[PDB]
Amino acid sequence: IFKVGDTVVYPHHGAALVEAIETRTIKGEQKEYLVLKVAQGDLTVRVPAENAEYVGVRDVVGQEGLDKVFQVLRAPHTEEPTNWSRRYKANLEKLASGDVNKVAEVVRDLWRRDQERGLSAGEKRMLAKARQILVGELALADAKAETILDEVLAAAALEHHHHHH
Amino acid sequence: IFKVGDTVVYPHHGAALVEAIETRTIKGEQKEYLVLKVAQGDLTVRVPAENAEYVGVRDVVGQEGLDKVFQVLRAPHTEEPTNWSRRYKANLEKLASGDVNKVAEVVRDLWRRDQERGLSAGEKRMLAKARQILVGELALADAKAETILDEVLAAAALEHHHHHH
Incomplete structure (x- = not known):
């Protein structure tokens, strides 16, 4: 399938840590978001809790x-x-x-x-x-x-x- | 499900580029390996071609x-x-x-x-x-x-x- 010069989507799997959970009310409902420490602290990613399939x-x-x-x-x-x-x-x-x-x-x-x-x-x-x-x-x-x-x-x-x- | 302090596996999806393909004969068969440039050049990952599901x-x-x-x-x-x-x-x-x-x-x-x-x-x-x-x-x-x-x-x-x- 693959040849030199080809671009692919690579899943760089790694450990993430939930440092914080944000609760929001968007009228008029409760929404939870995870604040993740990923890449050993080089990156913060914030993701909806219900859409966090990890x-x-x-x-x-x-x-x-x-x-x-x-x-x-x-x-x-x-x-x-x-x-x-x-x-x-x-x-x-x-x-x-x-x-x-x-x-x-x-x-x-x-x-x-x-x-x-x-x-x-x-x-x-x-x-x-x-x-x-x-x-x-x-x-x-x-x-x-x-x-x-x-x-x-x-x-x-x-x-x-x-x-x- | 999630709470503060929880550890998860996070798939940090990103672009990877096939810079090289290595062919090996392991007696006595041909084995192909992709040499991937990932993380904009910060990381090289080498993966078997048949086990590259990208x-x-x-x-x-x-x-x-x-x-x-x-x-x-x-x-x-x-x-x-x-x-x-x-x-x-x-x-x-x-x-x-x-x-x-x-x-x-x-x-x-x-x-x-x-x-x-x-x-x-x-x-x-x-x-x-x-x-x-x-x-x-x-x-x-x-x-x-x-x-x-x-x-x-x-x-x-x-x-x-x-x-x-």
């Missing part, structure tokens, strides 16, 4: 926790053990860690391996499990929200982000 | 044209004629202009009026028409792509973006 993320994670997860999934230079066993054992340790950032590394590495060379049976089952742990650490206590979240995270996992300002 | 945008518009349209739709300080007739006549002129930026102003103003106070019958029909012109100026020569594009533009229209770096 997946929520747990408070223990927060804006910084969520942006960190995105950074991990989008990390371009990864170091993966070449040998299956060393790699499997390391990811096993990561899934048992309780650190969402390490779970993200597993999800990232395995999604990329899947599209690149394909997964072994155990690796495929590991990916199914890691994705579910990651979503579980992030999503609000909903199955539709978890599906959307899983898609967003999977797409991020495939992306290498290079920052140059 | 709406394309016409070349006459381009990356700068597309980002401009987003800026217009997200403009927070708008000046709209209070009187219905003055407002209607101005938007009529804009829809006949051939300038996609002016069409964007109509789409923006009417989406916001709709959620705020509601539209008159003529204004509602104007919005239906403006959205279709805007999509037509942007989309590739597909009805699924136009639907997604229309949703993206509508969501942008409702958003006030404040830049503070």
Whole structure:
């Protein structure tokens, strides 16, 4: 489909924080607006509450926790053990860690391996499990929200982000 | 749903440009990757071509044209004629202009009026028409792509973006 010079709409997914809610009466009804901190404070976006179709993320994670997860999934230079066993054992340790950032590394590495060379049976089952742990650490206590979240995270996992300002 | 302190995933939609396509052979198959210029050159994202589910945008518009349209739709300080007739006549002129930026102003103003106070019958029909012109100026020569594009533009229209770096 794509060729050099093509312009597309890219969804730069990221963490946003509700810093304020504005209530207005427009005659003669109540209207609520979210004031969002997005891009780590570089941008304020104000959006109607009823037109805010965004997946929520747990408070223990927060804006910084969520942006960190995105950074991990989008990390371009990864170091993966070449040998299956060393790699499997390391990811096993990561899934048992309780650190969402390490779970993200597993999800990232395995999604990329899947599209690149394909997964072994155990690796495929590991990916199914890691994705579910990651979503579980992030999503609000909903199955539709978890599906959307899983898609967003999977797409991020495939992306290498290079920052140059 | 939402309250202050809540963290969400915000899709910061924007223009991306395919600057390069990388071809790789991973034994022993061909794999294509897009090298995207996103955030006006602040970020490079590299994504597998087969996993790039992005709406394309016409070349006459381009990356700068597309980002401009987003800026217009997200403009927070708008000046709209209070009187219905003055407002209607101005938007009529804009829809006949051939300038996609002016069409964007109509789409923006009417989406916001709709959620705020509601539209008159003529204004509602104007919005239906403006959205279709805007999509037509942007989309590739597909009805699924136009639907997604229309949703993206509508969501942008409702958003006030404040830049503070």
